[PDB]
Amino acid sequence: MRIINAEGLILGRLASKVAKMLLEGEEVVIVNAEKAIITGNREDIFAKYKQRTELRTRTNPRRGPFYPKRSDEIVRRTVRGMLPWKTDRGRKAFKRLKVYVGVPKEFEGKEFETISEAHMSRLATPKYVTVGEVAKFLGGKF
Amino acid sequence: KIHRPRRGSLAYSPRKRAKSIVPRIRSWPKDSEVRMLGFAGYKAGMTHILMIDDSPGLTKGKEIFVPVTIVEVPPLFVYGIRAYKQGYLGLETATEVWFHDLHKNVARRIKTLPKNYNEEAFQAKLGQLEDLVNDGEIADVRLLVHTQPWLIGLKKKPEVMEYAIGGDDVKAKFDYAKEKIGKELRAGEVLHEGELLDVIAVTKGKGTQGPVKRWGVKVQFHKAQRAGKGRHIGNLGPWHPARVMWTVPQAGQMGFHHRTEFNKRLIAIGENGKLVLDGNEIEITPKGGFPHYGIVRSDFLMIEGTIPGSFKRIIRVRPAIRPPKKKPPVERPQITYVSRESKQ
Amino acid sequence: VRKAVVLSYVGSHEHRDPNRVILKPLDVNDRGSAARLIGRKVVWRTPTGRKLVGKIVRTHGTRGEVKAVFKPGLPGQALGDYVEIL
RNA sequence: CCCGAAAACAGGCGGCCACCGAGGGCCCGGGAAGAAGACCC
RNA sequence: CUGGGGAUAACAGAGUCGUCUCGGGCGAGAGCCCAUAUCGACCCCGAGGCUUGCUACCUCGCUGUCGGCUCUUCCCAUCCUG
RNA sequence: CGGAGUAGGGGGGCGGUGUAAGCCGUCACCCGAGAGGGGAACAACCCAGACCGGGGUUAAGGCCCCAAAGUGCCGGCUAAGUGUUACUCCAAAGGGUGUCCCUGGCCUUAGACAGCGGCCCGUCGAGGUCAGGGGCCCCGAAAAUGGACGGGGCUUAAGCCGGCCGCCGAGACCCCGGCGCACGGACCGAUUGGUCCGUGAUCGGGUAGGCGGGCGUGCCGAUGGGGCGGAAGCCGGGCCGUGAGGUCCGGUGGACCCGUCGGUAUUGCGGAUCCUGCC
RNA sequence: CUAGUACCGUGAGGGAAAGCUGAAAAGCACCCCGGGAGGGGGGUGAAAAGAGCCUGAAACCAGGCGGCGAUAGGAGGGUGCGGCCCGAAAGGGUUGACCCUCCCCGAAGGAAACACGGGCGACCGUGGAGUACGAGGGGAGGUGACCGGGGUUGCACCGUCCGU
């Protein structure tokens, strides 16, 4: 499987590349999800994500949108948004993905791939926030 | 427009039948004293006493009526030790160690016991667990306990539970557990007179009830009483949203719920059915016996107030996860009268 | 083994042609010269070992993909699978 | 505080059996449980 | 009474906002003197769709009703509580 | 000469009226009576008018993923997720040492602040200060189930301005092969015609409606036939036919049936809150 | 056809449904089960055609056979393929199904590597080259048995019922 280290990567670009990989047919693992970044203003970003988490069906909450509070689930959900999710093809492609906070002992001892199109260095404006900080604001465990 | 609060709470939903009659403890208190953080017994009945008030507030120093519940507590047996480690999300069990000689009745809960499992094997397993804990991987140690309902002739099938240990050192906890395993444990070694406690049990069952009693809904006007709708709610909601909302009160199961109470005071701990007030030794059992429960004969807790459950139900106790700031002293109060007249 | 990946059917976002297919060769040299495969046969194997045969027709884009005709066409069970060039 | 292994990474631990038979149900005497089912002794 | 009509009213809905509810700009002044603590003419610019009108796109046997009782939920342009 | 249908129109542009929406006319491009390719979905906004099977090139538009094709190039702007909207279907008067530009005056080697010292000098001693106009953004800016740039998301962009280079993409256009139609012609029929040739960039959508040719059902006059070695009907299958349909195979069945020419008719059903029977 | 009958209404009056064993009753002797309707064996007849009787359609019901079937979204279909099952005759085919290899022609259309130059650049020009290829049209050599068709289902994309 292709193991990718997310330290210092732009989220949507990472997700686009990963989605195309999955559709072409590869198995992908992503480590260090809490260290990817989101560009823009702290308050706007936090407001957007809080609004997302406070969406719910008014007649039954056991149904309803379940938007994440954890960093790995946030990354996973971005990728899922980038796929055709209402088809067997996309369901399989999404099943072929795994995301992890940190580097678990299992993967300890390997060399990690990167992505050039996605890296903090193509940027010039310092306004940026971390997915771990988003998760802390929302109140999720790591 | 008229305003008023909604009928009932949404904090105890869904209001369904409890998963088990044996209640589960979800959270534990932070205690510095290295001890077992709870006990279990069986509810017996209620009486009242006259005591001199201790707690802060008005009425302090005066003689007051106090209702009392009695809980029979025979000694527990410690049959195991568990180790916990930290996984990706939460805690996960690392391993278990059991005692080799268990009562014949334990097989009524645990149908599949080991065949030979001698003492030397038990000791080797203890040693393995000790060395595992002695490294730094382990994060928590808990005791495995079973009741002994046969001493008091109530039944023969025991209740099996897990209890946490106080402190903040796994090695201290393990030393305690290793000095406890394989033996009987009493309530006086665990609890201290005057404490505040939280009680846990499953409430009395009442079957299916309607919304008037399940939620506090009002009875309609007498015209509706003669129309056929007295004990009904008006409507299930508006045109849009074109569905029934989960917040609308409806009929269903009432009673037999898992519930927790806060800050009930432990008054006294008795032995062999007796209490010592002024040198005397008096019996708590009233003349004729407790209704629907016979004579108390082993050991008992005296708890202030009321507690969930029917009479012969299993009760669990833990110390005060959420106490107030002006606690009363941890000491048995001055009691002037205990009622032991007939209760039926 | 001189193989390629099947990517997609030909067409637009709203319609597709089910007898034509877009292929991505895996070797970097064939990708650098994908036009030197125009006219070559290309085979796909079924779960029962049967063979479906097609032909590379022309180039598609600039990144190194090619277009192929397969009459009789391929099934949807072959869209992220391997194909062998001859 | 209440619900919660159908949490599709559909979990962890200990133990028993298989690779005749572990275990479970009907049945019998009964409630602290109960519309039928279920629950408990 | 019969036959029809949403080719055409009452009626809720759609559209519009003259009117309605809520605001703003500039500054004559009033405020012992001091436009702006407070009030703020004349004249200009708006939001909402909760009042009434205008229109006649939808329904002529969908339900043709007002008010009250009962039950749930949302908005803020906040009466009290911070 | 003969046979009709049409006497409620609508979208879009222009005019009178009206607070406006709408009302009344006007033009005659579209929908009605118009498939296909796009605008998220849209009767009339864009491309574009359709016999059948195939092969290619373009149009509208698009090229980070959903989704075929560029994480494309050069110069510049925006920091507000502003924006990511051709139209259908997007809030202003009034303000802003927020930033990027253009212009025109006035002081300058001791100027325009602060400062040692009451218009003055010793020092901080190098450029500054007023007016207009432009681009982008900001304030002005409040609504009711949970939520809408189509979504994910995007910050030297996947946004905006001025330009540029390649690629993808229709039934449109080019090409090969087949069907028909209109017109003309040659030859040929025991009745409304038939075989073949030539032309068709300038023939191939279609409601109301008009016209031509065919399929099928029951009876009569003639002609040619089949049938207990198994007619009609029924069930399941194969072949021909654009098709309405026809014919053959096997099984069931047990007494009548068909082709051609010419005539006749209670002659073809999915609907009528249709009628009868059955379920 | 036991019809102006049965049946409806105080009455004046209103008014149905219902055809066919077989040439011949040869209309089922005798046995076992069952309280009995009857069932199962045996018989008549060219054929059960069995009096609930010519033929015996559809809707509907049950069983058997085949395919699918408990993580999943559209008016129940359309295009293209894949998997399981049926495939005597009426369709093709040992006078050769299907598959494999090479050779010739070829409409519209139509590349690339590489070499030399222009452009800040994305790219372009010249030559290669009207070559490789190309819908179709023909021919030569090899293996030897199915193909077409039908039922059901899987994937991809499209598709908001009929009449007024």
- Resolution (angstroms) stands at 2.7
Residue position matching structure tokens 């297919």:
C21
Listed residue (A74, A77, A91) closest to A133, CA to CA: A74
| Residue from A21, A23, A24, A87 to probe the interface with C (highest C Cβ count within 10 Å) | A24
Angle separating helix axes A71-81 and A11-24, nearest 10 degrees: 60
**Nearest CA-CA partner of B214 in B232, B236, B201:** B232
The answer to whether B261 and B307 have CB atoms below 8 angstroms apart is: yes
Contact assignment for C5 to A24 by CB distance below 8 Å? yes
- Asked if C5 and A89 come within 8 Å (Cβ–Cβ), the reply is no
Which nucleotides on chain G have any atom < 7 A from a protein Cβ? 72-73, 79-84, 100-101, 111-113, 123, 132-135, 154-158
Using a CB-CB distance cutoff of 8 angstroms, which residues of chain B are in contact with residue A60?
246
**Kind and range of the H or E run holding B226:** helix B222-227
| Closest of B318, B299, B339 to residue B44, by C-alpha | B299
Q: Could you give the residue ranges of the DSSP H alpha helices within B11-144?
A: 119-133
Peptide bond into C72 cis (omega under 30): yes
Tokens of B213: 């009693």
How far does CA C53 lie from the centroid of its chain?
10
Instruction: Give the residue numbers in B contacting A (CB under 8 Å), as ranges.
Output: 88-89, 241, 243-246
Q: Is the peptide bond before B241 cis (omega within 30 degrees of 0)?
A: yes
φ, ψ at A20 (rounded to 5°): -65, -40
Nearest-angstrom CA–CA distance, B122 and B116: 11
| Residues after which chain C has a gap (C–N > 2.5 Å) | none
A100, closest residue in chain B (CA to CA): B88
Measured between CA atoms, the residue of chain A closest to residue C7 is: A24
Distance CA A77, CA C37 (A): 40
A89·C79 Cβ contact <8 A:
yes
Tell me if A58 and B89 make a contact (CB, 8 A cut-off).
no
Q: Which chains touch A (3 or more CB pairs under 8 A)?
A: B, C
Buried b / exposed e along B270-293 (16+ C-beta atoms within 10 A): beebebeeeeeeebbbbeebbeeb
Of A58, A60, A64, A67, nearest in space to B14 by CA? A60
Q: Which method was it determined by? A: cryo-EM
Q: Indicate the length of chain B as a whole number.
A: 344
B238 touches strand E (CB under 7 A): yes
- State CA C42 to chain mean position distance: 7
